[PDB]
Scaffold this active site. Sequence first.
Site, PDB file in Angstrom:
ATOM      1  N   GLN A  88       0.829  -1.201   0.000  1.00 47.80           N
ATOM      2  CA  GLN A  88       0.000   0.000   0.000  1.00 47.80           C
ATOM      3  C   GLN A  88       0.865   1.254   0.000  1.00 47.80           C
ATOM      4  OE1 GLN A  88      -1.114   2.752   1.479  1.00 47.80           O
ATOM      5  NE2 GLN A  88      -3.297   2.894   0.984  1.00 47.80           N
TER       6      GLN A  88
ATOM      7  N   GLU B 152      -4.150  -6.607  -2.061  1.00 47.06           N
ATOM      8  CA  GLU B 152      -5.483  -6.040  -1.919  1.00 47.06           C
ATOM      9  C   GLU B 152      -5.805  -5.206  -3.149  1.00 47.06           C
ATOM     10  OE1 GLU B 152      -4.111  -3.919   1.917  1.00 47.06           O
ATOM     11  OE2 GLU B 152      -5.181  -2.343   0.829  1.00 47.06           O
TER      12      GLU B 152
ATOM     13  N   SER C 191       6.951  -0.531   2.121  1.00 42.78           N
ATOM     14  CA  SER C 191       6.825  -0.213   3.536  1.00 42.78           C
ATOM     15  C   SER C 191       7.087  -1.471   4.350  1.00 42.78           C
ATOM     16  CB  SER C 191       5.438   0.346   3.854  1.00 42.78           C
ATOM     17  OG  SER C 191       5.378   0.832   5.183  1.00 42.78           O
TER      18      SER C 191
ATOM     19  N   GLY D 131       2.339  -5.871   6.344  1.00 46.45           N
ATOM     20  CA  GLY D 131       2.342  -7.272   5.975  1.00 46.45           C
ATOM     21  C   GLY D 131       2.903  -7.577   4.602  1.00 46.45           C
TER      22      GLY D 131
ATOM     23  N   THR E  92       1.111   3.764  13.027  1.00 51.51           N
ATOM     24  CA  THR E  92      -0.242   3.254  12.827  1.00 51.51           C
ATOM     25  C   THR E  92      -0.473   1.913  13.517  1.00 51.51           C
ATOM     26  OG1 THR E  92      -0.547   4.434  10.731  1.00 51.51           O
ATOM     27  CG2 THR E  92      -1.871   2.453  11.094  1.00 51.51           C
TER      28      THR E  92
ATOM     29  N   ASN F 138       8.033   8.664   8.667  1.00 49.22           N
ATOM     30  CA  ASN F 138       6.936   9.610   8.492  1.00 49.22           C
ATOM     31  C   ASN F 138       7.019  10.830   9.399  1.00 49.22           C
ATOM     32  OD1 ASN F 138       5.246   8.554   6.392  1.00 49.22           O
ATOM     33  ND2 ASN F 138       4.620   6.911   7.788  1.00 49.22           N
TER      34      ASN F 138
ATOM     35  N   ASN G   7       4.296  12.352  -0.148  1.00 49.94           N
ATOM     36  CA  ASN G   7       4.747  11.602  -1.316  1.00 49.94           C
ATOM     37  C   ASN G   7       5.399  12.515  -2.346  1.00 49.94           C
ATOM     38  OD1 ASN G   7       3.787   9.128  -0.270  1.00 49.94           O
ATOM     39  ND2 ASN G   7       1.728   9.546  -1.057  1.00 49.94           N
TER      40      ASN G   7
ATOM     41  N   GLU H 288      28.161   5.031  -9.361  1.00 44.56           N
ATOM     42  CA  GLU H 288      29.035   5.865  -8.537  1.00 44.56           C
ATOM     43  C   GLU H 288      28.343   6.246  -7.233  1.00 44.56           C
ATOM     44  OE1 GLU H 288      31.330   8.838 -11.169  1.00 44.56           O
ATOM     45  OE2 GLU H 288      29.650   8.218 -12.432  1.00 44.56           O
TER      46      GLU H 288
HETATM   47  N1  LIG Z   1       4.631   8.153   4.184  1.00 47.94           N
HETATM   48  C1  LIG Z   1       3.697   7.285   3.811  1.00 47.94           C
HETATM   49  N2  LIG Z   1       3.574   6.077   4.470  1.00 47.94           N
HETATM   50  C2  LIG Z   1       2.624   5.188   4.095  1.00 47.94           C
HETATM   51  C3  LIG Z   1       1.769   5.487   3.045  1.00 47.94           C
HETATM   52  N3  LIG Z   1       0.930   4.444   2.880  1.00 47.94           N
HETATM   53  C4  LIG Z   1       1.236   3.498   3.795  1.00 47.94           C
HETATM   54  N4  LIG Z   1       2.275   3.945   4.564  1.00 47.94           N
HETATM   55  C5  LIG Z   1       2.922   3.208   5.667  1.00 47.94           C
HETATM   56  O1  LIG Z   1       2.524   1.849   5.657  1.00 47.94           O
HETATM   57  C6  LIG Z   1       2.399   1.372   6.979  1.00 47.94           C
HETATM   58  C7  LIG Z   1       1.369   0.253   7.083  1.00 47.94           C
HETATM   59  O2  LIG Z   1       1.385  -0.585   5.949  1.00 47.94           O
HETATM   60  P1  LIG Z   1       0.312  -0.325   4.781  1.00 47.94           P
HETATM   61  O3  LIG Z   1       0.912   0.571   3.729  1.00 47.94           O
HETATM   62  O4  LIG Z   1      -0.940   0.274   5.372  1.00 47.94           O
HETATM   63  O5  LIG Z   1      -0.024  -1.756   4.133  1.00 47.94           O
HETATM   64  P2  LIG Z   1       1.132  -2.667   3.491  1.00 47.94           P
HETATM   65  O6  LIG Z   1       2.500  -2.136   3.840  1.00 47.94           O
HETATM   66  O7  LIG Z   1       0.935  -2.723   1.998  1.00 47.94           O
HETATM   67  O8  LIG Z   1       0.887  -4.120   4.134  1.00 47.94           O
HETATM   68  P3  LIG Z   1      -0.608  -4.705   4.220  1.00 47.94           P
HETATM   69  O9  LIG Z   1      -1.287  -4.091   5.419  1.00 47.94           O
HETATM   70  O10 LIG Z   1      -0.560  -6.202   4.385  1.00 47.94           O
HETATM   71  O11 LIG Z   1      -1.371  -4.349   2.968  1.00 47.94           O
HETATM   72  C8  LIG Z   1       1.989   2.578   7.802  1.00 47.94           C
HETATM   73  O12 LIG Z   1       2.602   2.545   9.069  1.00 47.94           O
HETATM   74  C9  LIG Z   1       2.482   3.771   7.009  1.00 47.94           C
HETATM   75  O13 LIG Z   1       3.570   4.370   7.670  1.00 47.94           O
HETATM   76  C10 LIG Z   1       1.887   6.698   2.378  1.00 47.94           C
HETATM   77  O14 LIG Z   1       1.132   6.969   1.446  1.00 47.94           O
HETATM   78  N5  LIG Z   1       2.856   7.597   2.765  1.00 47.94           N
HETATM   79 MG   LIG Z   2      -2.237  -3.873   1.105  1.00 50.48          MG
END
Ligand SMILES: Nc1nc2c(ncn2[C@@H]2O[C@H](COP(=O)(O)OP(=O)(O)OP(=O)(O)O)[C@@H](O)[C@H]2O)c(=O)[nH]1
Ligand SMILES: [Mg+2]
Lengths: 439, 430, 430, 103, 97
Positions: free
Chosen positions: A11, A71, A140, A144, A179, A206, A228, A254
């Site tokens: 995500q 997802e 991220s 998960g 989060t 963040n 972003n 480099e």
């Molecule tokens: N800076 C920033 N962080 C994000 C963003 N979207 C998700 N995150 C980070 O992603 C972390 C949680 O994971 P998610 O992105 O919600 O979901 P995922 O990493 O794809 O893993 P799943 O929950 O299994 O789908 C949060 O703690 C956020 O810090 C974003 O648009 N900008």
């Molecule tokens: Mg996801």
Amino acid sequence: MREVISIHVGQGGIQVGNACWELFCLEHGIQPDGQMPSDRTIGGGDDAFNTFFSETGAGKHVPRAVFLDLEPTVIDEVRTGTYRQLFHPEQLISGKEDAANNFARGHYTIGKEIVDLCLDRIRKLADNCTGLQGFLVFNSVGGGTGSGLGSLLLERLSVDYGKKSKLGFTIYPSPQVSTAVVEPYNSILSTHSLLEHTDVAVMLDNEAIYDICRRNLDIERPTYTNLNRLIAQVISSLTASLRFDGALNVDITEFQTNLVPYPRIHFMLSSYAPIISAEKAYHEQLSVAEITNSAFEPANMMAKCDPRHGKYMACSMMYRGDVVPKDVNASIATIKTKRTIQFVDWCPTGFKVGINYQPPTVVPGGDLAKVMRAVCMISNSTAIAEVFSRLDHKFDLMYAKRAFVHWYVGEGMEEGEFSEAREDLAALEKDYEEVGIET
Amino acid sequence: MREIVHIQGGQCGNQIGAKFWEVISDEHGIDPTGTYHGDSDLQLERINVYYNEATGGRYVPRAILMDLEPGTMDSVRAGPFGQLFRPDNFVFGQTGAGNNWAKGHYTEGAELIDSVLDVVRKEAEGCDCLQGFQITHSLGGGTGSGMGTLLISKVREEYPDRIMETFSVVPSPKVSDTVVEPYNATLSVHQLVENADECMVIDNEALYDICFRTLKLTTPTYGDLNHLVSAAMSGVTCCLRFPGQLNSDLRKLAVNLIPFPRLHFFMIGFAPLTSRGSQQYRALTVPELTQQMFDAKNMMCAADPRHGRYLTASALFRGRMSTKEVDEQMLNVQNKNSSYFVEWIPNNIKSSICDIPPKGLKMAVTFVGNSTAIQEMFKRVAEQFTAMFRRKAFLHWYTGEGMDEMEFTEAESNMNDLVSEYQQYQDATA
Amino acid sequence: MREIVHIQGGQCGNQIGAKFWEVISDEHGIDPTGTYHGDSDLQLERINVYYNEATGGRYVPRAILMDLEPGTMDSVRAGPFGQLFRPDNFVFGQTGAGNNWAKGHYTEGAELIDSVLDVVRKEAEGCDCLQGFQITHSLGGGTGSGMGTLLISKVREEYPDRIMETFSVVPSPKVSDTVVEPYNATLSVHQLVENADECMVIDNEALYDICFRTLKLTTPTYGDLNHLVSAAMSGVTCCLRFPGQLNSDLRKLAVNLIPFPRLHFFMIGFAPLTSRGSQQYRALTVPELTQQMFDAKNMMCAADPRHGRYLTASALFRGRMSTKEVDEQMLNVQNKNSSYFVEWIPNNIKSSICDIPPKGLKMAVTFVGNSTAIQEMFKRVAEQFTAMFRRKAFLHWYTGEGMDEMEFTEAESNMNDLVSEYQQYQDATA
Amino acid sequence: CDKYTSTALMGNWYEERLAPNQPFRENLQTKTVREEEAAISFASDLIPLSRVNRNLPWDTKGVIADDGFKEFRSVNRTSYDPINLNNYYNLGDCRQLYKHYTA
Amino acid sequence: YVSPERLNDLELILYEKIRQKTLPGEDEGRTVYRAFKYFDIAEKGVIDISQFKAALEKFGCVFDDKEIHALFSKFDVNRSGKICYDEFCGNFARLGS
Ligand SMILES: Nc1nc2c(ncn2[C@@H]2O[C@H](COP(=O)(O)OP(=O)(O)OP(=O)(O)O)[C@@H](O)[C@H]2O)c(=O)[nH]1
Ligand SMILES: [Mg+2]
Ligand SMILES: Nc1nc2c(ncn2[C@@H]2O[C@H](COP(=O)(O)OP(=O)(O)O)[C@@H](O)[C@H]2O)c(=O)[nH]1
Ligand SMILES: Nc1nc2c(ncn2[C@@H]2O[C@H](COP(=O)(O)OP(=O)(O)O)[C@@H](O)[C@H]2O)c(=O)[nH]1
């Protein structure tokens, strides 16, 4: 002829891919539907878009990008967004069931049924490519599928392709602004896999970027789209030299010969300047000396880490605009002069400078103003052991009672895997301690 | 597209389900005739999550209505939005349960459960990718507490990995409608712990208190309590149906809320709630939402949250907002109230964001919490149970239908162990 | 062009045939007076299979009508669509059979059958290229069960290479309307296994169960059962009359459904079937059609197909659909029920597609299945027969026309041999 | 309404002057709501289920009513908004030297 | 210019491919509605000739611009140049019934 491949999983990885691909299309004057609008282009940039786009034979250009997630929510909304006609229809791979904030789910049970499709798409992209430079992965770790599928992809890529360079723009949790609740488990385990499989890691937490927006842009109500765009700006500045004319050009190779002293020490953190709004920009000097000074300011750094608690190993300077090489040398010498910023003994020279003539590009509807100069700073420092220290502290505190463990053992993970991740980071944290000593 | 099926039993369960389907149909813009008359495109992108499609463009809910007497389903058909449910999704007997757990679980419930199991199997196999189950029933009655939990056991045995949700209206001593509540309530709670993945306990007394103090309306009825429960249920699954910034499904809640397999009894709440006379005098900001969310009087349970310590908590914000204030407010409420959050776990609050608020509202928040204050709910029920059981009162009906005192003895022992293991974390220190 | 003639005997046969011809006339757009009133040329392209040519461009069916009592044909002449039948085809007796196999097979049937044999011989010689015969009658009556099977024997003697179909209605112990049914039922079965190439058992019990349960109408009459049988009879031979993706005829069905010459007793079912208040709540798709096809309660026999193993199976689809959907649905239904299919004949299911759906429907399915679970009907019939026969009850009526106990004994032995063969081929392994 | 019939300034009088109609309360003679009929589907036990004339639905709307917010927008949808890219294209350098009509 | 009994054949070819692309448990009208609502951006309910050509092209039907006017003219009864795809989807659902 020279180009890179971008990996966007999870995500967080996809939602930052939206901002960067908005900028790349805009910087080369490419419409969202893919048609270059001509407008007497007559090869104005000529051969400069191959780094991020490929000609389709007649008209439109398609990016060299692949999107992964378990997802379909984020994938589908891109397919119905303003950039629906841009990306390749079968390069937006969408899963069936989300990892649900679990490391084992995305790495042993449902993460093994999607890697085969992803590897095939990468292979097709590589074959069409001719001068492949490396890979860029956005993911991220405090989640998960991002930590799960991303780690699986890195292992598969390292065996299939081998010595191609990889650079990872990860997002670790902030010290207190975060989060999820079970994120220390996923964060610890992912560091185990990426330590010996990637070559350059950049920390993109963040909380640090929240302070940047409030202090500089005076925005008290920021969202992810603001963050972003800042991360997207760093990417373009970092890779600008690969596709534009410059007085001192630096390609992605480099970096490992200039910023990585030892194989186990390749974790770094970034900074960017100037960061000003459209109201205060025109009352200020914005000199080259000032922009290079503000980049070294500890609160201007893009990761929640204080560089005064550690030394420095290697720094990279990426200037763009109308900078003059004589000005850079004079400004750099002043940085070395002051005693507050101290380097390490075994590195008498620690600056790599790259200069590009292309001024920064501004997105309409953005928060930044149109300036003439900018700088991107990537620093390798021993202070990074601080952020790893608190992650270890969080893990041990909630692992003594085996909290949330049954969620992991019941998917395929063995209980003994948790101990191994602890030991390697225990080894890693003291590697930084040992290097920081003086001869 | 990760669909969920719905099952409702008993009088209270049927009424809750009817109100919930009314609310969901209104939110998705489906008229009582099943024809789409919505406004935006987002209402149809994920409509398959809750509705099936049939020839003629009409949408029918995938719900099963089950009871041992035809009294209540006559009412749900006669009432508004009663034409949405398929006529094939109604199964019933002729006798009723009569507030006896054995009648609804051993003799009459077992005889009828085959047809409802067949219907559930057909509906589950119909959809592409099943996501889980949600149950609405009451543990203080005969047919619900028994027949629903028997169906729960059967469906859990058949589908091992899908998530299961229950919304149990557990009894309370301030407002009592039956003289035999402790027996079947204790038996159902014993049978529910080994099968249900997530339980959300509800008290009629708590919603009466909410209606009296917050909404300030003199004479509400079961309609308003049903509406509040339906609003909470709809707000639970907002991200599964609408786009947002941080998407979280049912499974993501379980991982972030369940530390141990036998600790899955939650308490819920909703915000904002305002009286009709003071609607326009309050601003719409995130701090107001969290301030009303962590209100001790805003819960759906009679138990006081400030009498224990939260293990984990979850919040599901809806509407367009700034993520920075969400994290800052969670940090502030976790800091100024460090006494009410258990120390050996860091950052025990999870936040999720959805872009589509309920119709007519800008911002809405659904709160799910796992605390140690639930144990007083079981403490008082078991206290009544033993006092009634020492004299063997009202026991001959149970013993006259193939049931033995051994099962009661097992049920009471399981309650005590659950309470002990659920409360020892309050005093345990790292 | 490979046309088929129709024969119906007895009151039950006449009642089935009247409604079958009504349904066929409606399908081909023929008014009760015999004048074409259709809309498409496909309806008239293949009219010669059932209808001959007459004066004024009117069409008359090539159906022979026969019974020993004039009342049933007096009723069918005045019934709806009664003007299509040629008066020459009516063959009548003057006395009746009185539910006596001996009377209907030896004394009166023998002296009356010469005229109907001449009529059917003339009809068969009239056509350029005959395809086969089909008979509808009841095995519990006297006149049908005797004279129809004697005619079957004579026709099989005279035309060896042609195929024979028998839509036979056999009695069941539950809905019994005759005391002497076991004798003539067993005798008719023993005679039918001699000459009938294909037998399709139909049960009034099964038809009543279907009307009570699926269509959910309170007061069924014989007309509804006749309509169901007529729908199946029209469906079984649709592709021979209309174009399709994969053509299939009755000989092809016999080849693909008959592994051994003595195993020719099929069991049939039709889909879809819905009530009036449930037509709008369901979506018509191949998955639901094939789910209803194999349902045990949907069949037209008292035998339960899950008590045995299918040997072969057939499916005939009507309407426009993709072939891949049908192929994968049959593959899935074969895979998920590997315990209900005998394992030494892989791919024991057949498919065919026709692109002309019945009027009022968009898709339809007819199922013809050969199973070893059909032997239970013969077992119970033979049990009743031997229980009645050990005391020689009602035997004077049968022995008063020259029949002796040797015929009874040989019929019983042949029935037992058929049951034993079915069991032996059921419990056979590679 | 505290043991009274409103229009009198008793305890909790201000809020109930805003209760919309509540048709059930003042019309407990009508009953009706007899729209089920002998459906014969839903159900059969063959006897259709007995029907009883139910009473009025009692209003509801306990959750806060609408505040005139249509909403139904996405953060991603409004964030990019190709109007922004359209304005940064085929436009600019307009200072109105002479007077001219423009879109 | 071409307008023999060929527009009907083109419509029949058009109908088969929507039925081919139709999602399970849905009518052709909803599928074609999704396509037009995908292409259009003004959300007013009417599009131009190029958007209709693109909508036909996504289905896989490839034709020259000449007959694209012929098909559009048949559906655009009012000669206004704007087509209300509501009636388009309704007519094609009626023909697909
Ligand atoms: N800076 C920033 N962080 C994000 C963003 N979207 C998700 N995150 C980070 O992603 C972390 C949680 O994971 P998610 O992105 O919600 O979901 P995922 O990493 O794809 O893993 P799943 O929950 O299994 O789908 C949060 O703690 C956020 O810090 C974003 O648009 N900008
Ligand atoms: Mg996801
Ligand atoms: N909140 C709420 N509670 C209800 C409603 N209807 C019934 N109940 C509760 O359900 C309890 C009676 O349960 P009962 O219907 O006898 O259970 P059953 O015999 O299994 O159907 C009472 O104590 C009520 O408080 C309702 O609409 N809302
Ligand atoms: N399904 C069905 N069964 C019928 C019909 N007419 C008669 N029967 C059955 O046939 C039996 C009587 O058969 P009968 O008329 O004596 O046969 P016949 O002597 O050959 O004419 C009764 O038990 C009925 O159940 C019909 O139209 N449909």
